[PDB]
Design a protein around this ligand. Sequence first.
Ligand SMILES: OC[C@H]1O[C@@](CO)(O[C@H]2O[C@H](CO)[C@@H](O)[C@H](O)[C@H]2O)[C@@H](O)[C@@H]1O
Lengths: 275, 100, 9
Amino acid sequence: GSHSMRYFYTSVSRPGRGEPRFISVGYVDDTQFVRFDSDAASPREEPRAPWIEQEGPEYWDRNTQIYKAQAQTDRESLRNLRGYYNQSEAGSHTLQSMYGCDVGPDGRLLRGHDQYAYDGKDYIALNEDLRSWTAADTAAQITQRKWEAAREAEQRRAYLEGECVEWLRRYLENGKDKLERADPPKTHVTHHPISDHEATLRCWALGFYPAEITLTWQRDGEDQTQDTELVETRPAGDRTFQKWAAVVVPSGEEQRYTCHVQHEGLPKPLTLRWE
Amino acid sequence: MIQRTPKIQVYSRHPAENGKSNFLNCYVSGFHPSDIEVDLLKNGERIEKVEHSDLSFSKDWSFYLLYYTEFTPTEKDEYACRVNHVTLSQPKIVKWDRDM
Amino acid sequence: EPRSPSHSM
Ligand SMILES: OC[C@H]1O[C@@](CO)(O[C@H]2O[C@H](CO)[C@@H](O)[C@H](O)[C@H]2O)[C@@H](O)[C@@H]1O
């Protein structure tokens, strides 16, 4: 199917306590596969999914040096940014970076991404054309002019069209079923009396991958959208996800309610009931 | 500076059954800035060996983390998650309920 | 694999 690779960097300054903390994580779809933390004992890129472990020592060594250099660059960017915004040199600030590629079933690039946020606000982003920047304000225009003069967009385009696509293809081949084949949810309905007149029906979806899912309660086939409590999809901690949806119903009317589950891993949408 | 208040959910990795080994999770998400303190509590006391996922974030730049520990649920033992963040005027405690 | 370092902002 269609797949993505993304890297997420976070740098947080701490003036008076040393250099900023830099953390990076890499994802293929909804699966984290690598991490780096500048505050680790002997910082290096580390595996976080079984299928990446097979990469040789040259892979880990090259990526580790990249993150160490990027941390130093982010430190200089944080210094420049507080200057652009005329901010105190005493305070802590955050620079986040996100980049990567979306590819189709054939493995061809559909869309590239390279964008940045300062103190939680969009700052600068590479446009869809992979050739031009969009700046959020006059500070970001300073960065834009620097990056235009340095031909930074060409450096990003080269990665996003080349290495990003090629390495994503390789991770998918190595990952196999864990990445290419969706794991459908294990599902069940629970019932919890609230009083003699009302009970909660809760529809559970557990152990599914990827995270995208829809859970809806219907009463005689009419969606109960305005009366359903839905929790945000949440990680189980073993690389799968969980969600539930609940409705409060009159005692003795439970048979009127069905839960409808849509997930990529299911052959067809499921209809569940209290049983 | 943008501040966003954390959302918190506390739950087990698998449906709880007393005497059977499991994982207790506290998922904190939707927050900014990244500085946050999360403790898992067993009968009101801080659990000592707690791990957390690597700091990551969503499309709106808000952060998320999973704090987790191996545990064996019983009938008696009460579990909870306590979270401190700049946006919270006091620590937020969310109790574990095996049906949620 | 990650992208090689950017220029600073
Ligand atoms: O929080 C427990 C801790 O507090 C101490 C005082 O340092 O004792 C208090 O809590 C005890 C357990 O509930 C009580 O028995 C006692 O009355 C109370 O002062 C410590 O002894 C204990 O480890």
